[PDB]
PDB file of C-alpha atoms and ligand atoms in Angstrom:
ATOM      1  CA  UNK A   1      -0.128   0.024  -0.009  1.00 47.59           C
ATOM      2  CA  UNK A   2       0.898   3.743  -0.517  1.00 45.48           C
ATOM      3  CA  UNK A   3      -0.904   4.931   2.682  1.00 45.02           C
ATOM      4  CA  UNK A   4      -3.556   4.040   5.155  1.00 46.37           C
ATOM      5  CA  UNK A   5      -6.305   6.048   6.921  1.00 46.81           C
ATOM      6  CA  UNK A   6      -9.253   5.531   9.257  1.00 47.31           C
ATOM      7  CA  UNK A   7     -12.392   7.654  10.083  1.00 50.28           C
ATOM      8  CA  UNK A   8     -14.187   6.884  13.251  1.00 47.74           C
ATOM      9  CA  UNK A   9     -17.602   8.530  12.667  1.00 45.04           C
ATOM     10  CA  UNK A  10     -20.339   9.859  15.098  1.00 46.26           C
ATOM     11  CA  UNK A  11     -22.901  12.593  15.336  1.00 41.33           C
ATOM     12  CA  UNK A  12     -25.777  14.174  17.251  1.00 42.60           C
ATOM     13  CA  UNK A  13     -28.050  10.995  16.984  1.00 45.94           C
ATOM     14  CA  UNK A  14     -27.713   7.297  16.740  1.00 48.01           C
ATOM     15  CA  UNK A  15     -25.267   7.040  13.901  1.00 48.18           C
ATOM     16  CA  UNK A  16     -21.705   5.873  14.262  1.00 44.92           C
ATOM     17  CA  UNK A  17     -19.221   3.700  12.422  1.00 47.53           C
ATOM     18  CA  UNK A  18     -15.606   3.165  11.307  1.00 47.28           C
ATOM     19  CA  UNK A  19     -14.465   3.550   7.661  1.00 46.43           C
ATOM     20  CA  UNK A  20     -10.950   2.589   6.478  1.00 43.78           C
ATOM     21  CA  UNK A  21      -9.064   3.894   3.368  1.00 42.06           C
ATOM     22  CA  UNK A  22      -6.139   2.100   1.776  1.00 43.78           C
ATOM     23  CA  UNK A  23      -4.229   3.341  -1.316  1.00 41.92           C
ATOM     24  CA  UNK A  24      -3.909  -0.014  -3.085  1.00 41.95           C
ATOM     25  CA  UNK A  25      -2.032   1.467  -5.981  1.00 45.25           C
ATOM     26  CA  UNK A  26      -1.388   5.064  -7.191  1.00 44.57           C
ATOM     27  CA  UNK A  27      -4.735   4.637  -9.236  1.00 48.31           C
ATOM     28  CA  UNK A  28      -6.917   2.922  -6.640  1.00 47.56           C
ATOM     29  CA  UNK A  29      -8.137   3.840  -3.167  1.00 47.90           C
ATOM     30  CA  UNK A  30     -10.152   1.339  -1.421  1.00 47.08           C
ATOM     31  CA  UNK A  31     -12.702   2.807   1.097  1.00 45.11           C
ATOM     32  CA  UNK A  32     -14.631   0.158   3.240  1.00 44.32           C
ATOM     33  CA  UNK A  33     -16.444  -0.016   6.486  1.00 43.09           C
ATOM     34  CA  UNK A  34     -19.501  -0.275   8.566  1.00 42.89           C
ATOM     35  CA  UNK A  35     -21.960   2.503   9.575  1.00 41.99           C
ATOM     36  CA  UNK A  36     -24.893   1.868  11.763  1.00 40.73           C
ATOM     37  CA  UNK A  37     -27.803   3.464  13.593  1.00 41.59           C
ATOM     38  CA  UNK A  38     -29.044   4.640  10.304  1.00 41.65           C
ATOM     39  CA  UNK A  39     -32.565   4.812   8.706  1.00 41.35           C
ATOM     40  CA  UNK A  40     -32.917   2.028   6.082  1.00 42.10           C
ATOM     41  CA  UNK A  41     -32.286   3.091   2.616  1.00 41.28           C
ATOM     42  CA  UNK A  42     -29.758   5.207   0.798  1.00 42.99           C
ATOM     43  CA  UNK A  43     -27.496   7.778   2.342  1.00 40.97           C
ATOM     44  CA  UNK A  44     -24.973  10.251   0.773  1.00 39.91           C
ATOM     45  CA  UNK A  45     -21.508   9.798   1.711  1.00 37.20           C
ATOM     46  CA  UNK A  46     -18.751  12.538   1.142  1.00 34.60           C
ATOM     47  CA  UNK A  47     -15.385  13.612   1.982  1.00 33.85           C
ATOM     48  CA  UNK A  48     -15.473  17.246   3.149  1.00 33.04           C
ATOM     49  CA  UNK A  49     -12.929  19.978   3.150  1.00 32.68           C
ATOM     50  CA  UNK A  50     -11.950  19.998   6.925  1.00 31.88           C
ATOM     51  CA  UNK A  51     -11.819  17.930   9.921  1.00 32.72           C
ATOM     52  CA  UNK A  52     -12.528  20.593  12.440  1.00 36.51           C
ATOM     53  CA  UNK A  53     -15.010  19.018  14.879  1.00 35.87           C
ATOM     54  CA  UNK A  54     -15.212  22.154  17.236  1.00 36.33           C
ATOM     55  CA  UNK A  55     -18.748  22.651  15.916  1.00 39.67           C
ATOM     56  CA  UNK A  56     -19.615  19.180  15.315  1.00 38.77           C
ATOM     57  CA  UNK A  57     -20.148  18.296  11.642  1.00 39.66           C
ATOM     58  CA  UNK A  58     -20.794  21.999  10.763  1.00 39.88           C
ATOM     59  CA  UNK A  59     -17.212  22.991  10.945  1.00 42.09           C
ATOM     60  CA  UNK A  60     -16.172  20.385   8.457  1.00 40.90           C
ATOM     61  CA  UNK A  61     -16.772  22.669   5.335  1.00 43.12           C
ATOM     62  CA  UNK A  62     -18.244  21.553   1.938  1.00 45.70           C
ATOM     63  CA  UNK A  63     -17.567  18.573  -0.187  1.00 45.39           C
ATOM     64  CA  UNK A  64     -13.892  18.363  -0.911  1.00 45.17           C
ATOM     65  CA  UNK A  65     -13.504  20.066  -4.307  1.00 42.58           C
ATOM     66  CA  UNK A  66     -10.025  21.013  -5.305  1.00 41.77           C
ATOM     67  CA  UNK A  67     -10.807  21.016  -8.987  1.00 40.92           C
ATOM     68  CA  UNK A  68     -13.856  23.333  -8.779  1.00 40.80           C
ATOM     69  CA  UNK A  69     -16.168  20.879 -10.258  1.00 38.52           C
ATOM     70  CA  UNK A  70     -20.077  20.447  -9.859  1.00 38.97           C
ATOM     71  CA  UNK A  71     -21.371  17.825  -7.525  1.00 38.49           C
ATOM     72  CA  UNK A  72     -21.892  14.481  -9.294  1.00 39.56           C
ATOM     73  CA  UNK A  73     -21.716  10.497  -8.668  1.00 39.36           C
ATOM     74  CA  UNK A  74     -18.670   8.672  -8.120  1.00 38.66           C
ATOM     75  CA  UNK A  75     -18.927   7.314 -11.661  1.00 38.58           C
ATOM     76  CA  UNK A  76     -19.133  10.742 -13.161  1.00 40.88           C
ATOM     77  CA  UNK A  77     -16.463  12.861 -14.785  1.00 38.21           C
ATOM     78  CA  UNK A  78     -17.806  16.078 -13.514  1.00 39.14           C
ATOM     79  CA  UNK A  79     -17.801  15.301  -9.468  1.00 43.18           C
ATOM     80  CA  UNK A  80     -16.287  16.877  -6.476  1.00 45.74           C
ATOM     81  CA  UNK A  81     -13.264  14.927  -5.534  1.00 44.97           C
ATOM     82  CA  UNK A  82     -15.164  14.130  -2.264  1.00 45.88           C
ATOM     83  CA  UNK A  83     -18.190  12.624  -4.017  1.00 48.72           C
ATOM     84  CA  UNK A  84     -18.617   9.024  -3.023  1.00 48.95           C
ATOM     85  CA  UNK A  85     -22.278   8.514  -3.832  1.00 51.75           C
ATOM     86  CA  UNK A  86     -24.643   6.618  -1.694  1.00 48.02           C
ATOM     87  CA  UNK A  87     -24.296   3.792   0.693  1.00 51.26           C
ATOM     88  CA  UNK A  88     -27.331   1.518   1.555  1.00 55.19           C
ATOM     89  CA  UNK A  89     -28.459   0.866   5.056  1.00 54.88           C
ATOM     90  CA  UNK A  90     -30.355  -2.383   5.581  1.00 57.78           C
ATOM     91  CA  UNK A  91     -33.515  -2.926   7.461  1.00 54.44           C
ATOM     92  CA  UNK A  92     -31.397  -3.401  10.645  1.00 54.65           C
ATOM     93  CA  UNK A  93     -29.828   0.269   9.926  1.00 53.58           C
ATOM     94  CA  UNK A  94     -26.546  -1.012   9.118  1.00 51.27           C
ATOM     95  CA  UNK A  95     -24.500  -0.015   6.057  1.00 53.80           C
ATOM     96  CA  UNK A  96     -21.595  -2.340   5.174  1.00 52.69           C
ATOM     97  CA  UNK A  97     -19.865  -1.170   2.201  1.00 56.33           C
ATOM     98  CA  UNK A  98     -16.737  -1.376  -0.100  1.00 56.73           C
ATOM     99  CA  UNK A  99     -15.759   0.912  -2.905  1.00 57.77           C
ATOM    100  CA  UNK A 100     -12.680   1.816  -4.897  1.00 55.32           C
ATOM    101  CA  UNK A 101     -12.165   5.236  -6.140  1.00 54.03           C
ATOM    102  CA  UNK A 102      -9.739   6.409  -8.901  1.00 58.65           C
ATOM    103  CA  UNK A 103      -9.867  10.217  -7.866  1.00 56.46           C
ATOM    104  CA  UNK A 104      -9.726  10.266  -4.157  1.00 58.85           C
ATOM    105  CA  UNK A 105      -6.029   9.729  -2.819  1.00 61.57           C
ATOM    106  CA  UNK A 106      -5.238   8.924   0.788  1.00 63.16           C
ATOM    107  CA  UNK A 107      -2.511  11.597   0.812  1.00 61.38           C
ATOM    108  CA  UNK A 108      -5.059  14.207  -0.232  1.00 58.75           C
ATOM    109  CA  UNK A 109      -7.752  13.438   2.342  1.00 58.88           C
ATOM    110  CA  UNK A 110      -5.703  13.174   5.480  1.00 61.40           C
ATOM    111  CA  UNK A 111      -7.013  15.362   8.248  1.00 56.99           C
ATOM    112  CA  UNK A 112     -10.260  15.952   6.255  1.00 55.16           C
ATOM    113  CA  UNK A 113     -13.548  14.528   7.386  1.00 55.26           C
ATOM    114  CA  UNK A 114     -15.969  11.632   6.114  1.00 55.49           C
ATOM    115  CA  UNK A 115     -19.732  12.631   6.534  1.00 56.52           C
ATOM    116  CA  UNK A 116     -22.773  10.618   6.130  1.00 56.12           C
ATOM    117  CA  UNK A 117     -26.100  12.174   5.197  1.00 53.25           C
ATOM    118  CA  UNK A 118     -29.685  12.079   6.153  1.00 51.57           C
ATOM    119  CA  UNK A 119     -31.048  11.122   2.836  1.00 54.20           C
ATOM    120  CA  UNK A 120     -30.238   9.967  -0.661  1.00 54.01           C
ATOM    121  CA  UNK A 121     -27.690  11.776  -2.762  1.00 53.52           C
ATOM    122  CA  UNK A 122     -29.235  12.462  -6.117  1.00 51.35           C
ATOM    123  CA  UNK A 123     -25.908  12.351  -7.898  1.00 48.50           C
ATOM    124  CA  UNK A 124     -26.326  15.746  -9.469  1.00 44.64           C
ATOM    125  CA  UNK A 125     -29.261  14.286 -11.581  1.00 48.51           C
ATOM    126  CA  UNK A 126     -32.197  15.396  -9.535  1.00 45.89           C
ATOM    127  CA  UNK A 127     -33.039  18.495 -11.395  1.00 46.94           C
ATOM    128  CA  UNK A 128     -33.317  20.219  -7.858  1.00 48.73           C
ATOM    129  CA  UNK A 129     -31.632  23.623  -7.013  1.00 51.11           C
ATOM    130  CA  UNK A 130     -29.427  21.552  -4.821  1.00 49.54           C
ATOM    131  CA  UNK A 131     -28.571  18.811  -7.200  1.00 49.76           C
ATOM    132  CA  UNK A 132     -25.239  20.014  -8.670  1.00 48.54           C
ATOM    133  CA  UNK A 133     -24.309  21.845  -5.434  1.00 48.33           C
ATOM    134  CA  UNK A 134     -24.780  18.941  -2.659  1.00 46.49           C
ATOM    135  CA  UNK A 135     -26.914  16.315  -4.147  1.00 48.27           C
ATOM    136  CA  UNK A 136     -29.786  17.262  -2.029  1.00 47.71           C
ATOM    137  CA  UNK A 137     -29.166  14.686   0.596  1.00 48.05           C
ATOM    138  CA  UNK A 138     -30.250  16.714   3.794  1.00 51.73           C
ATOM    139  CA  UNK A 139     -28.719  17.111   7.034  1.00 52.14           C
ATOM    140  CA  UNK A 140     -25.210  15.647   8.049  1.00 53.55           C
ATOM    141  CA  UNK A 141     -25.766  12.741  10.509  1.00 53.25           C
ATOM    142  CA  UNK A 142     -22.378  11.770  11.529  1.00 54.49           C
ATOM    143  CA  UNK A 143     -18.716  12.886  10.670  1.00 53.73           C
ATOM    144  CA  UNK A 144     -15.314  11.557  11.473  1.00 55.88           C
ATOM    145  CA  UNK A 145     -11.795  12.855  10.839  1.00 53.54           C
ATOM    146  CA  UNK A 146      -9.645  10.916   8.380  1.00 53.67           C
ATOM    147  CA  UNK A 147      -6.692  10.104  10.305  1.00 55.58           C
ATOM    148  CA  UNK A 148      -3.367   8.542   9.342  1.00 54.41           C
ATOM    149  CA  UNK A 149      -3.135   4.714  10.386  1.00 54.09           C
ATOM    150  CA  UNK A 150      -0.336   2.220  10.224  1.00 54.93           C
ATOM    151  CA  UNK A 151      -3.119  -0.062   8.840  1.00 55.39           C
TER     152      UNK A 151
ATOM    153  CA  UNK B   1      -0.678  31.861   6.819  1.00 57.20           C
ATOM    154  CA  UNK B   2       0.426  28.495   5.374  1.00 56.95           C
ATOM    155  CA  UNK B   3      -2.232  26.233   6.721  1.00 57.15           C
ATOM    156  CA  UNK B   4      -4.225  25.748   9.965  1.00 60.28           C
ATOM    157  CA  UNK B   5      -5.119  22.652  12.063  1.00 61.05           C
ATOM    158  CA  UNK B   6      -6.974  21.698  15.207  1.00 63.47           C
ATOM    159  CA  UNK B   7      -6.957  18.707  17.700  1.00 65.66           C
ATOM    160  CA  UNK B   8      -9.818  17.872  20.217  1.00 65.49           C
ATOM    161  CA  UNK B   9      -8.388  16.066  23.185  1.00 65.30           C
ATOM    162  CA  UNK B  10     -10.182  13.470  25.338  1.00 62.86           C
ATOM    163  CA  UNK B  11      -9.214  10.262  27.283  1.00 63.18           C
ATOM    164  CA  UNK B  12     -10.297   7.824  29.887  1.00 66.18           C
ATOM    165  CA  UNK B  13     -10.255  10.359  32.748  1.00 67.81           C
ATOM    166  CA  UNK B  14     -11.160  14.062  33.155  1.00 66.81           C
ATOM    167  CA  UNK B  15      -8.541  15.548  30.573  1.00 64.39           C
ATOM    168  CA  UNK B  16      -9.956  17.446  27.796  1.00 65.29           C
ATOM    169  CA  UNK B  17      -9.393  20.438  25.635  1.00 66.18           C
ATOM    170  CA  UNK B  18      -8.751  22.020  22.173  1.00 66.59           C
ATOM    171  CA  UNK B  19      -5.544  23.056  20.652  1.00 70.18           C
ATOM    172  CA  UNK B  20      -5.027  24.939  17.451  1.00 67.10           C
ATOM    173  CA  UNK B  21      -1.981  25.247  15.030  1.00 65.30           C
ATOM    174  CA  UNK B  22      -1.471  27.970  12.459  1.00 66.26           C
ATOM    175  CA  UNK B  23       1.720  28.021  10.164  1.00 68.32           C
ATOM    176  CA  UNK B  24       2.505  31.849  10.458  1.00 71.70           C
ATOM    177  CA  UNK B  25       5.599  31.699   8.113  1.00 73.11           C
ATOM    178  CA  UNK B  26       7.628  29.116   6.558  1.00 70.43           C
ATOM    179  CA  UNK B  27       9.673  28.930   9.858  1.00 70.20           C
ATOM    180  CA  UNK B  28       7.121  29.254  12.500  1.00 72.21           C
ATOM    181  CA  UNK B  29       4.137  27.359  13.652  1.00 72.96           C
ATOM    182  CA  UNK B  30       1.824  28.798  16.236  1.00 70.03           C
ATOM    183  CA  UNK B  31       0.405  26.346  18.807  1.00 70.13           C
ATOM    184  CA  UNK B  32      -2.128  27.700  21.200  1.00 72.23           C
ATOM    185  CA  UNK B  33      -4.423  25.545  23.554  1.00 70.16           C
ATOM    186  CA  UNK B  34      -6.262  25.088  26.778  1.00 70.16           C
ATOM    187  CA  UNK B  35      -6.480  21.702  28.234  1.00 72.30           C
ATOM    188  CA  UNK B  36      -8.481  21.069  31.509  1.00 72.28           C
ATOM    189  CA  UNK B  37      -8.922  18.226  33.989  1.00 74.18           C
ATOM    190  CA  UNK B  38      -5.142  17.783  34.662  1.00 73.90           C
ATOM    191  CA  UNK B  39      -3.265  17.362  38.025  1.00 74.27           C
ATOM    192  CA  UNK B  40      -1.348  20.585  38.784  1.00 73.12           C
ATOM    193  CA  UNK B  41       2.208  20.634  37.409  1.00 75.01           C
ATOM    194  CA  UNK B  42       4.125  19.857  34.301  1.00 77.70           C
ATOM    195  CA  UNK B  43       2.773  17.390  31.655  1.00 76.33           C
ATOM    196  CA  UNK B  44       4.565  16.195  28.380  1.00 80.17           C
ATOM    197  CA  UNK B  45       2.886  17.341  25.288  1.00 81.46           C
ATOM    198  CA  UNK B  46       3.763  15.418  21.875  1.00 82.33           C
ATOM    199  CA  UNK B  47       2.650  14.838  18.449  1.00 83.27           C
ATOM    200  CA  UNK B  48       2.598  11.030  17.671  1.00 82.66           C
ATOM    201  CA  UNK B  49       2.814   9.259  14.392  1.00 83.08           C
ATOM    202  CA  UNK B  50      -0.888   8.194  13.809  1.00 86.58           C
ATOM    203  CA  UNK B  51      -4.326   9.871  14.464  1.00 89.24           C
ATOM    204  CA  UNK B  52      -5.899   6.309  14.548  1.00 92.12           C
ATOM    205  CA  UNK B  53      -7.860   6.066  17.859  1.00 88.39           C
ATOM    206  CA  UNK B  54      -9.407   2.595  17.148  1.00 89.59           C
ATOM    207  CA  UNK B  55      -7.517   1.505  20.256  1.00 90.83           C
ATOM    208  CA  UNK B  56      -7.853   4.782  21.926  1.00 89.09           C
ATOM    209  CA  UNK B  57      -4.464   6.459  22.546  1.00 89.33           C
ATOM    210  CA  UNK B  58      -2.722   3.178  22.224  1.00 89.18           C
ATOM    211  CA  UNK B  59      -2.981   3.118  18.374  1.00 90.46           C
ATOM    212  CA  UNK B  60      -1.283   6.671  17.999  1.00 90.63           C
ATOM    213  CA  UNK B  61       2.312   5.128  17.683  1.00 95.44           C
ATOM    214  CA  UNK B  62       5.286   6.904  19.008  1.00 96.90           C
ATOM    215  CA  UNK B  63       6.606  10.580  18.917  1.00 97.09           C
ATOM    216  CA  UNK B  64       6.598  11.718  15.178  1.00 98.18           C
ATOM    217  CA  UNK B  65      10.244  11.360  14.178  1.00102.02           C
ATOM    218  CA  UNK B  66      10.737  11.636  10.570  1.00103.49           C
ATOM    219  CA  UNK B  67      14.417  12.628  11.011  1.00105.54           C
ATOM    220  CA  UNK B  68      15.377   9.711  13.255  1.00106.04           C
ATOM    221  CA  UNK B  69      16.385  12.052  16.123  1.00108.81           C
ATOM    222  CA  UNK B  70      16.705  11.566  19.849  1.00110.85           C
ATOM    223  CA  UNK B  71      14.026  12.744  22.240  1.00109.34           C
ATOM    224  CA  UNK B  72      14.623  16.331  23.216  1.00109.71           C
ATOM    225  CA  UNK B  73      13.121  19.500  24.171  1.00110.06           C
ATOM    226  CA  UNK B  74      11.324  21.902  21.624  1.00110.88           C
ATOM    227  CA  UNK B  75      14.382  24.391  21.595  1.00110.17           C
ATOM    228  CA  UNK B  76      16.802  21.596  21.149  1.00111.90           C
ATOM    229  CA  UNK B  77      18.259  20.670  17.570  1.00115.24           C
ATOM    230  CA  UNK B  78      18.462  17.059  18.536  1.00119.04           C
ATOM    231  CA  UNK B  79      14.614  16.424  19.220  1.00120.76           C
ATOM    232  CA  UNK B  80      11.777  14.676  17.640  1.00121.57           C
ATOM    233  CA  UNK B  81       9.789  16.604  15.245  1.00122.95           C
ATOM    234  CA  UNK B  82       6.730  15.989  17.481  1.00123.68           C
ATOM    235  CA  UNK B  83       8.516  17.136  20.720  1.00124.60           C
ATOM    236  CA  UNK B  84       6.852  20.083  22.252  1.00128.37           C
ATOM    237  CA  UNK B  85       7.941  19.920  25.854  1.00130.45           C
ATOM    238  CA  UNK B  86       5.884  20.608  28.765  1.00130.63           C
ATOM    239  CA  UNK B  87       2.781  22.523  29.643  1.00130.22           C
ATOM    240  CA  UNK B  88       1.852  23.659  33.053  1.00128.07           C
ATOM    241  CA  UNK B  89      -1.382  23.003  34.641  1.00134.69           C
ATOM    242  CA  UNK B  90      -2.475  25.547  37.184  1.00134.67           C
ATOM    243  CA  UNK B  91      -4.127  24.788  40.609  1.00133.55           C
ATOM    244  CA  UNK B  92      -7.344  24.378  39.154  1.00134.57           C
ATOM    245  CA  UNK B  93      -6.019  21.867  36.426  1.00137.17           C
ATOM    246  CA  UNK B  94      -6.039  23.934  33.574  1.00133.67           C
ATOM    247  CA  UNK B  95      -3.065  24.374  31.266  1.00135.68           C
ATOM    248  CA  UNK B  96      -3.412  27.410  28.805  1.00134.17           C
ATOM    249  CA  UNK B  97      -0.317  27.592  26.633  1.00135.35           C
ATOM    250  CA  UNK B  98       1.124  29.315  23.368  1.00136.06           C
ATOM    251  CA  UNK B  99       4.289  28.246  21.579  1.00136.70           C
ATOM    252  CA  UNK B 100       5.812  29.203  18.427  1.00134.25           C
ATOM    253  CA  UNK B 101       7.635  26.152  16.898  1.00134.56           C
ATOM    254  CA  UNK B 102      10.371  26.502  14.342  1.00135.19           C
ATOM    255  CA  UNK B 103      10.680  22.532  13.380  1.00134.11           C
ATOM    256  CA  UNK B 104       7.083  21.243  13.455  1.00134.03           C
ATOM    257  CA  UNK B 105       5.050  22.286  10.471  1.00133.19           C
ATOM    258  CA  UNK B 106       1.134  22.266  10.080  1.00134.32           C
ATOM    259  CA  UNK B 107       1.465  19.994   7.088  1.00132.74           C
ATOM    260  CA  UNK B 108       3.504  17.495   9.412  1.00132.61           C
ATOM    261  CA  UNK B 109       0.779  17.329  11.916  1.00125.80           C
ATOM    262  CA  UNK B 110      -2.499  16.781  10.067  1.00124.29           C
ATOM    263  CA  UNK B 111      -4.082  13.321  10.325  1.00127.37           C
ATOM    264  CA  UNK B 112      -1.748  12.715  13.280  1.00125.05           C
ATOM    265  CA  UNK B 113      -2.417  12.893  16.983  1.00127.64           C
ATOM    266  CA  UNK B 114      -1.556  15.257  19.785  1.00127.66           C
ATOM    267  CA  UNK B 115      -1.018  13.586  23.266  1.00127.67           C
ATOM    268  CA  UNK B 116      -0.713  14.908  26.799  1.00127.69           C
ATOM    269  CA  UNK B 117       1.147  12.676  29.218  1.00126.97           C
ATOM    270  CA  UNK B 118       0.681  11.816  33.002  1.00125.99           C
ATOM    271  CA  UNK B 119       3.857  13.364  34.084  1.00123.71           C
ATOM    272  CA  UNK B 120       6.774  15.648  33.289  1.00122.01           C
ATOM    273  CA  UNK B 121       8.819  15.284  30.105  1.00116.94           C
ATOM    274  CA  UNK B 122      12.382  15.332  31.228  1.00115.47           C
ATOM    275  CA  UNK B 123      13.403  16.729  27.761  1.00113.94           C
ATOM    276  CA  UNK B 124      16.031  13.980  27.232  1.00115.27           C
ATOM    277  CA  UNK B 125      18.008  15.356  30.270  1.00110.68           C
ATOM    278  CA  UNK B 126      16.960  12.972  33.070  1.00109.95           C
ATOM    279  CA  UNK B 127      19.692  10.246  32.613  1.00114.36           C
ATOM    280  CA  UNK B 128      16.994   7.468  32.378  1.00112.81           C
ATOM    281  CA  UNK B 129      16.882   4.757  29.753  1.00112.48           C
ATOM    282  CA  UNK B 130      13.494   6.379  28.492  1.00111.66           C
ATOM    283  CA  UNK B 131      14.956   9.978  28.441  1.00110.30           C
ATOM    284  CA  UNK B 132      16.134   9.937  25.005  1.00112.06           C
ATOM    285  CA  UNK B 133      13.217   7.841  23.779  1.00111.62           C
ATOM    286  CA  UNK B 134      10.009   9.384  25.294  1.00107.73           C
ATOM    287  CA  UNK B 135      11.309  11.750  28.040  1.00108.47           C
ATOM    288  CA  UNK B 136       9.922   9.379  30.691  1.00109.15           C
ATOM    289  CA  UNK B 137       6.693  11.127  31.237  1.00110.30           C
ATOM    290  CA  UNK B 138       4.511   8.144  32.112  1.00112.86           C
ATOM    291  CA  UNK B 139       0.971   7.270  30.697  1.00110.06           C
ATOM    292  CA  UNK B 140      -1.022   8.901  27.928  1.00108.21           C
ATOM    293  CA  UNK B 141      -3.822  10.990  29.685  1.00106.86           C
ATOM    294  CA  UNK B 142      -5.626  12.138  26.480  1.00108.30           C
ATOM    295  CA  UNK B 143      -5.158  12.372  22.849  1.00109.06           C
ATOM    296  CA  UNK B 144      -6.758  14.230  19.936  1.00110.00           C
ATOM    297  CA  UNK B 145      -6.760  13.642  16.158  1.00112.66           C
ATOM    298  CA  UNK B 146      -5.149  16.753  14.549  1.00109.65           C
ATOM    299  CA  UNK B 147      -7.486  17.748  11.704  1.00107.48           C
ATOM    300  CA  UNK B 148      -7.323  20.488   8.945  1.00106.83           C
ATOM    301  CA  UNK B 149      -8.974  23.638   9.516  1.00104.90           C
ATOM    302  CA  UNK B 150      -9.918  26.616   7.579  1.00103.11           C
ATOM    303  CA  UNK B 151      -6.856  28.562   6.320  1.00101.67           C
ATOM    304  CA  UNK B 152      -8.961  31.777   5.431  1.00102.39           C
TER     305      UNK B 152
HETATM  306 ZN1   ZN C 201     -20.329  16.892  -3.922  1.00101.49          ZN
HETATM  307 ZN1   ZN C 202      10.030  12.707  21.710  1.00102.11          ZN
END
């Protein structure tokens, strides 16, 4: 690997979890973990600018966006670098997930935050005033700082 | 400035606080904090390798030491990059401190941990087998993940 990181998440309600990052190759970052306490269904998952938790998830800034792109889904060419699309919580409120990203690098996101949202990310497709800005996924439920790890 | 960071400390006991970093110039990093819940007296303060809290303060690794130096005080040229010496808690258990460090950089610290110790850092001077390794300051009381904060 070329770097490992871990985000330990929590928030003002029931939502908590642990998500790990591993830069498998220079091209591919593995992001995998488990978040629970969720309502069943799709929840937006994004990396945000900052990891400042002094105002809980409010001091984390916006989706990480170094290239000045619009909001999109993880497969889209026009996406914020922090845009990881949705994860699904099952009927027990548990989201166990695994994705690889080609844009996000561990070395870029160290000390930033990983945040899960109240609702579904529309992936910029929703035709809503927020679609190309946030994905219209409602409140931030839980956040964790992306911290360096031995792995 | 050339970057900002923040760490929120907690541990198993009463120790907690907030510490902020700002890289003022290429030479100088401002570190300013308040930590409460301490026993009165001197406590070691260090940046450690990792910000991984999955085993609480035990997964943070050792003092950050990219240059393979010996442990020292913050004004020494033989020190770990992460060596910030002692902070003093007053009679009420509060340590308010402000340092300007010439070696530690804000880009060093982010994603790592800031840890405050049970006892006094001997600054490498104590003649003990741990002096040049840790400063012999006992247990870890509290640790905070050092996060990026807004630079403007
Ligand atoms: Zn976005
Ligand atoms: Zn040291």
